[PDB]
Amino acid sequence: DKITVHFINRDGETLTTKGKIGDSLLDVVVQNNLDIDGFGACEGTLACSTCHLIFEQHIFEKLEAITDEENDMLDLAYGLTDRSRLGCQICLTKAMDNMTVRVP
Ligand code: FES
């Protein structure tokens, strides 16, 4: 199944695209060639902070439990919020249809 995801880019523009249930948010950016500068540098291997996304609170609270490995890297991210995750760790579910995520 596919869902719609909106990305607010760091230039304030919204990029709307579709992703498949089970794909990571990095897969969504890559597969759809979204023009988000520098996003996903390390290719989803927890060796960068560049796939950092800011979530809506209601989505964030139902995401999978964060690992220490993700958290340690995420701690170093520019514009870290209490609703932040590394996007390459987050896989799409139907709860996320029409959600908005933001790139700081
Ligand atoms: S793409 Fe590097 S940790 Fe997510």
List the helices and strands and how they pair.
Blueprint: E1 2-8, E2 14-20, H1 25-31, E3 52-54, H2 57-60, H3 68-74, E4 84-86, E5 99-102
The chain binds FE2/S2 (inorganic) cluster.
Residues 26, 40-42, 44-48, 50-51, 86, 88 line the site of FE2/S2 (inorganic) cluster (FES).
Structural features, described:
The protein contains three helices and five strands, in the order ββαβααββ. It has one domain: Beta-grasp domain (Ubiquitin-like (UB roll)), CATH 3.10.20.30. A hairpin with a 5-residue loop joins strand 1 and strand 2 (14-20). The protein starts with a strand and ends with a strand. Helix content is 17%, strand content 23%. The protein has a three-stranded mixed β-sheet with strand order 2-1-5, covered by helices on one side. The radius of gyration is 12 Å and the shape is globular. The chain is α+β, with helices and mostly antiparallel strands. The chain has helices at 25-31, 57-60, 68-74; strands at residues 2-8, 14-20, 52-54, 84-86, 99-102. The longest helix is centred in the first third of the chain and has 7 residues, at 25-31. The structure holds FE2/S2 (inorganic) cluster (FES). FE2/S2 (inorganic) cluster binds at residues 26, 40-42, 44-48, 50-51, 86, 88. The PDB classes it as electron transport.
